[PDB]
CSV table of C-alpha atoms and ligand atoms in Angstrom, one decimal:
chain,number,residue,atom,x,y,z
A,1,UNK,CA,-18.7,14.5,-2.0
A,2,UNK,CA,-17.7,10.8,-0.7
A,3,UNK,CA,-19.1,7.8,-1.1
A,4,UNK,CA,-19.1,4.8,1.5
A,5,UNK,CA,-19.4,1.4,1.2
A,6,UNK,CA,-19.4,-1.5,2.9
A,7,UNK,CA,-16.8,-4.3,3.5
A,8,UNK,CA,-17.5,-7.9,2.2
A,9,UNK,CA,-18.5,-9.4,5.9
A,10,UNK,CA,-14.7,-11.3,6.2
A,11,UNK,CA,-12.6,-8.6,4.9
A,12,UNK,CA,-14.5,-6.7,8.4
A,13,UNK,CA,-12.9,-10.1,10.3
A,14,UNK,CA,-9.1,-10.2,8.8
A,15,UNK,CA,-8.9,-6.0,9.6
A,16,UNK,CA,-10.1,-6.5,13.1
A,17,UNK,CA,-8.1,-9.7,13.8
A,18,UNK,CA,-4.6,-7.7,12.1
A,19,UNK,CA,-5.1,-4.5,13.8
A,20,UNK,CA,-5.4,-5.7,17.5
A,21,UNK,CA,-2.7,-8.7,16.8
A,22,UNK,CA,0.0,-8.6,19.2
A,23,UNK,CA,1.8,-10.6,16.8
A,24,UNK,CA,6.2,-9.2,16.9
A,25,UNK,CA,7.5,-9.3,13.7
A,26,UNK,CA,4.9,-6.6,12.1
A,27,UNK,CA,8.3,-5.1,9.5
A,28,UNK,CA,6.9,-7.7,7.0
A,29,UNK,CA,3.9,-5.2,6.0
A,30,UNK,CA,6.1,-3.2,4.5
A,31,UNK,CA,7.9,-6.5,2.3
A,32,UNK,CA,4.1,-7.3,1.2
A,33,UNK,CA,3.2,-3.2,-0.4
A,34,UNK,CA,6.5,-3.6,-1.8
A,35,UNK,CA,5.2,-6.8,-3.6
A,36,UNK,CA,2.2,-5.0,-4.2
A,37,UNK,CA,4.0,-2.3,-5.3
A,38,UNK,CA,6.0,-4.6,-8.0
A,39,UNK,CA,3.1,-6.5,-9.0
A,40,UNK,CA,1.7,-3.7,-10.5
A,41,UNK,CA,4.5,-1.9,-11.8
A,42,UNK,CA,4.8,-5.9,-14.0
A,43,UNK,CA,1.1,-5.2,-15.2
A,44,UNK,CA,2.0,-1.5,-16.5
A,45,UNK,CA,4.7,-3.0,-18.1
A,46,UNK,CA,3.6,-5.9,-19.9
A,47,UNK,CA,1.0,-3.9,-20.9
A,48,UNK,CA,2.9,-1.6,-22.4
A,49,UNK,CA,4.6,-4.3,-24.6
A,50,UNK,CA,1.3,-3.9,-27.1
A,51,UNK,CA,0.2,-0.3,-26.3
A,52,UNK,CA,3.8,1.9,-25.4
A,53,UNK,CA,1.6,5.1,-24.9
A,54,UNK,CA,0.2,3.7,-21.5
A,55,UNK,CA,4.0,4.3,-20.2
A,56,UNK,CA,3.7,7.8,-21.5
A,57,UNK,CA,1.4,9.4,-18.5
A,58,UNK,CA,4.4,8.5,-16.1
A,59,UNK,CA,7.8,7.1,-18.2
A,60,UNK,CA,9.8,6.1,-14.9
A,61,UNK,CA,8.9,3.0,-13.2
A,62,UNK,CA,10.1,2.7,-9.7
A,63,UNK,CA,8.5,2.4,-6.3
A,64,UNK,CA,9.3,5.5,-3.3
A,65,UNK,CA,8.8,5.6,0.3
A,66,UNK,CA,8.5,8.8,1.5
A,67,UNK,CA,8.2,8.8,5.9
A,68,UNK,CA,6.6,11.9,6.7
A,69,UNK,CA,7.7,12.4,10.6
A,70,UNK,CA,5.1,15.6,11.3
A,71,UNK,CA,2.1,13.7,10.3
A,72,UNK,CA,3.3,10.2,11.9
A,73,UNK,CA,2.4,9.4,7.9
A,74,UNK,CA,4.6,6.4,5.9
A,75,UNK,CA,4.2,6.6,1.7
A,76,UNK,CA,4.7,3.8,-0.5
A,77,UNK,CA,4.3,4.9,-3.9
A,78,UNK,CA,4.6,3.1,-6.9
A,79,UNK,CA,4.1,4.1,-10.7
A,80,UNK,CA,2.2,0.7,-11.6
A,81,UNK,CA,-0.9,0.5,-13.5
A,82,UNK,CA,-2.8,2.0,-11.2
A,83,UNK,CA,-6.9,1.4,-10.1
A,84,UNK,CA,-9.9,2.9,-11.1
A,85,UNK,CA,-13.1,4.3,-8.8
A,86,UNK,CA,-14.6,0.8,-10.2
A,87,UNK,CA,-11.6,-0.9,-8.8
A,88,UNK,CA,-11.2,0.2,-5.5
A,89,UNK,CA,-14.4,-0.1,-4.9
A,90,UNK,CA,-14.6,-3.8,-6.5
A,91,UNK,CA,-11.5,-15.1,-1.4
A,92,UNK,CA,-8.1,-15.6,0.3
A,93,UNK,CA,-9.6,-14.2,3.2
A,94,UNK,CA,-11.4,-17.4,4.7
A,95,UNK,CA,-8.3,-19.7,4.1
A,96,UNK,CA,-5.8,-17.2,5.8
A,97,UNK,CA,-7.8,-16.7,8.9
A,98,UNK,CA,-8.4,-20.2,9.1
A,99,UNK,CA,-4.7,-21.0,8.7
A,100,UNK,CA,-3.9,-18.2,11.6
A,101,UNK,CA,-5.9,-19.9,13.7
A,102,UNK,CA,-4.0,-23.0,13.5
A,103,UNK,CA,-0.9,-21.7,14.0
A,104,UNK,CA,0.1,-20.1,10.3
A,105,UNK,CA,2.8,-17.2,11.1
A,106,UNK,CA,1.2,-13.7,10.2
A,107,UNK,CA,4.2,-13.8,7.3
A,108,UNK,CA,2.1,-16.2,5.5
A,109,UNK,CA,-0.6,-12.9,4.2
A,110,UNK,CA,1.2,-12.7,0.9
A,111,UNK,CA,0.5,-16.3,-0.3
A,112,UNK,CA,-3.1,-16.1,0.4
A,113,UNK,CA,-3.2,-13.1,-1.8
A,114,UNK,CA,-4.4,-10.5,1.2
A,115,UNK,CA,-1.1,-9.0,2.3
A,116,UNK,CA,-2.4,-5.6,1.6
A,117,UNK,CA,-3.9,-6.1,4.3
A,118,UNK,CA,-1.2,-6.5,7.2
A,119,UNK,CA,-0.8,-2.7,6.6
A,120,UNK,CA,-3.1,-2.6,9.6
A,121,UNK,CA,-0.1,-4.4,11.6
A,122,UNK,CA,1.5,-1.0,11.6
A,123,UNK,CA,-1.2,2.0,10.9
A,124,UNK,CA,-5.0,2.1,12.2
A,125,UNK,CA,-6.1,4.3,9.0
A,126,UNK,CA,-4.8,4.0,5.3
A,127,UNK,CA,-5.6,6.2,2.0
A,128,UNK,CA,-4.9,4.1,-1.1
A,129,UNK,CA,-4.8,7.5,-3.7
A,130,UNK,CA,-4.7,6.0,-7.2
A,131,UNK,CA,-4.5,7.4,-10.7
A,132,UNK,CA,-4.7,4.5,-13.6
A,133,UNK,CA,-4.8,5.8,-16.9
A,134,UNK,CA,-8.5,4.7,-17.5
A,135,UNK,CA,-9.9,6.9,-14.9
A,136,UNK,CA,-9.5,10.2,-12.6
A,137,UNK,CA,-7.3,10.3,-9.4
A,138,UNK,CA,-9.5,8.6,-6.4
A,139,UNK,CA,-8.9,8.1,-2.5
A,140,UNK,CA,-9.7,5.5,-1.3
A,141,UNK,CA,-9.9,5.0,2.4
A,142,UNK,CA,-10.5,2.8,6.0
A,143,UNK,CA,-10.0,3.1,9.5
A,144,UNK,CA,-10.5,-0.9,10.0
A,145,UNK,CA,-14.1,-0.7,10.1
A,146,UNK,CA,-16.6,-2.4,8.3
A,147,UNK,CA,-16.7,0.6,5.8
A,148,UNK,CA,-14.9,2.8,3.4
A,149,UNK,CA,-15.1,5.6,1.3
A,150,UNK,CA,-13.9,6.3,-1.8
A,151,UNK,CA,-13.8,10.1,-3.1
A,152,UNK,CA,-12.4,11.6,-6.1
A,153,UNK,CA,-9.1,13.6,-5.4
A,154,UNK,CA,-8.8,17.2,-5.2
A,155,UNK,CA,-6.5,17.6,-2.5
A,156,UNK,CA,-3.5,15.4,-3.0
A,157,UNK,CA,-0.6,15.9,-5.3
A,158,UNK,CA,-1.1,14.3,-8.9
A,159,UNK,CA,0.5,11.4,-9.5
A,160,UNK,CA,1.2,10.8,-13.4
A,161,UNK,CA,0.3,7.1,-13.0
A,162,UNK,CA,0.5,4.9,-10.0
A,163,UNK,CA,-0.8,4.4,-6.8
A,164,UNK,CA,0.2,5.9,-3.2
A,165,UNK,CA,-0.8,3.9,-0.1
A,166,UNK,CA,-0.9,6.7,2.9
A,167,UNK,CA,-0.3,4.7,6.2
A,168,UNK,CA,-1.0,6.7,9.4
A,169,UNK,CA,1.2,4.7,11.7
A,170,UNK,CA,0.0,3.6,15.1
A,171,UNK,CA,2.2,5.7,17.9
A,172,UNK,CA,4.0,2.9,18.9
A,173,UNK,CA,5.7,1.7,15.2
A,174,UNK,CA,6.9,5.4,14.4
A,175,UNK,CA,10.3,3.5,14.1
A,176,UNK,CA,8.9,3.2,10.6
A,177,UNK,CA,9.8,6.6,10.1
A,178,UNK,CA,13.4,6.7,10.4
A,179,UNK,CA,15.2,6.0,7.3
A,180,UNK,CA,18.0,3.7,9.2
A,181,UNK,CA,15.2,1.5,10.0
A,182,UNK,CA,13.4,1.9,6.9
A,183,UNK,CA,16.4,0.7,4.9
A,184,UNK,CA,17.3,-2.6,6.6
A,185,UNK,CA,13.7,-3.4,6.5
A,186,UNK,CA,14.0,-3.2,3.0
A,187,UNK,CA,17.3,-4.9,2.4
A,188,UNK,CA,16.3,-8.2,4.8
A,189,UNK,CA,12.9,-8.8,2.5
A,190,UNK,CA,13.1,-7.2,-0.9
A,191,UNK,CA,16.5,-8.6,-2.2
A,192,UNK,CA,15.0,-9.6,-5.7
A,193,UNK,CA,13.0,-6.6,-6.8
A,194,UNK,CA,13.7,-5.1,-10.6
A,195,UNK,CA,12.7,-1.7,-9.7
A,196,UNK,CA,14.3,0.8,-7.8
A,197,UNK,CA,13.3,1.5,-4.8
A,198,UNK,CA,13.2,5.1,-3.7
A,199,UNK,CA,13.4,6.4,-0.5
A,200,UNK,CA,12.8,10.2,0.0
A,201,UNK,CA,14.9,11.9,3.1
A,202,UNK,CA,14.4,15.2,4.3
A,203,UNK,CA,17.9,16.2,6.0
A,204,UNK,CA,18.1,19.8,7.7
A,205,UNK,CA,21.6,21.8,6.0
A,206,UNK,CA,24.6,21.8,8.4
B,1,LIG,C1,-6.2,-8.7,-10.2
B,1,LIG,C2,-6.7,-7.9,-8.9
B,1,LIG,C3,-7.6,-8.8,-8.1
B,1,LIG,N1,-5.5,-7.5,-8.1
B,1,LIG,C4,-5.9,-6.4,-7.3
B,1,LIG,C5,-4.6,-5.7,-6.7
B,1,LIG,C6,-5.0,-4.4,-6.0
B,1,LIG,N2,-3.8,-3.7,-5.6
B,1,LIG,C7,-3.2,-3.7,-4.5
B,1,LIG,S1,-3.7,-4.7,-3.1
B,1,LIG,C8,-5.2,-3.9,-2.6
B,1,LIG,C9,-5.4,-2.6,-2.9
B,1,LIG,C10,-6.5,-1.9,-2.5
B,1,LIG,C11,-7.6,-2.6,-1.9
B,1,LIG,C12,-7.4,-4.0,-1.7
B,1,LIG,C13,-6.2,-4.6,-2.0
B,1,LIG,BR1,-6.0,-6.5,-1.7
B,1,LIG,O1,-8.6,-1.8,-1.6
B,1,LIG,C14,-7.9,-0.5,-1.5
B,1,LIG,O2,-6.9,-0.6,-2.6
B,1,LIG,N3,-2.1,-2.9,-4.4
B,1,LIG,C15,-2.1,-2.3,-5.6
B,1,LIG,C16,-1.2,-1.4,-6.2
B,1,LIG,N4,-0.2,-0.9,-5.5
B,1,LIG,N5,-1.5,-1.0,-7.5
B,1,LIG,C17,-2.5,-1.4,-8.2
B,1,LIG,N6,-3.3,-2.3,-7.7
B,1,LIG,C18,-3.1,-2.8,-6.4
């Protein structure tokens, strides 16, 4: 049972505009989850410092990429504090378009608070699965369009805390994929992050 919703009438406008962009330097989505990523690992955390036992549902704070080839699928995972059904469900928007249209670079997302967002600059379909401690694991997900749906989680490995965003990468930016790639990516934008930064490889035994 899943439930849809609609999209606040310019969020519809920024997906549309990003996805269809032709714009050439589309690696900086992945520098923008990674903020995400961080962002909320620094809420988990400074929460903690007054209630320790919110650390206890997942003790290791890091943030993991996990490219899964088969399904054209890229992972970012992070053990943050995580959002509730009420908070993916439940601005920057406005400004950023308006700057884009006279001339802002695409890179600019971040500081108008929307980089989640430029996901769309690499995948046409996204599941945001999330567990915080308040509430039950949810998915969360959007082709795009001017809907989502948001549906509680029976089908996806339980994450202890956190949040997993599940890009399905558009055929064309499966370079996102391969962990050379992936690496250098990371190294050229995320220099100054204080959590490690996983990434998962699957290597066949010589
Ligand atoms: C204070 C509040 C306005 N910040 C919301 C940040 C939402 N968010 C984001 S950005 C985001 C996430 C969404 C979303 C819109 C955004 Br923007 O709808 C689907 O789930 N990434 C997060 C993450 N990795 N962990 C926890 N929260 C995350």
């Amino acid at each position: 049972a899943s439930e849809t919703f609609e999209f606040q009438a310019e969020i519809t406008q920024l997906m549309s505009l990003i996805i269809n962009t032709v714009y050439s330097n589309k690696e900086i989505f992945l520098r923008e989850l990674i903020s995400n990523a961080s962002d909320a690992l620094d809420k988990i955390r400074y929460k903690s410092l007054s209630d320790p036992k919110q650390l206890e549902t997942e003790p290791d704070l890091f943030i993991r990429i996990t490219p899964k080839p088969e399904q054209k699928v890229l992972e970012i995972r992070d053990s943050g504090i995580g959002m509730t059904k009420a908070e993916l469900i439940n601005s920057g928007t406005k400004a950023f378009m308006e700057a884009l249209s006279a001339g802002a670079d695409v890179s600019m997302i971040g500081q108008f608070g929307v980089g989640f967002y430029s996901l769309f600059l690499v995948a046409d379909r996204v599941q945001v699965i999330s567990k915080s401690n308040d509430d039950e694991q949810y998915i969360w997900e959007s082709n795009a369009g001017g809907s989502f749906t948001v549906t509680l989680d029976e089908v996806n490995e339980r994450i202890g805390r956190g949040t997993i965003l599940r890009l399905f990468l558009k055929d064309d930016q499966l370079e996102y994929l391969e962990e050379k790639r992936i690496k250098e990516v990371i190294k050229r934008h995320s220099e100054f992050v204080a959590y490690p930064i996983q990434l998962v490889v699957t290597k066949e035994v010589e």
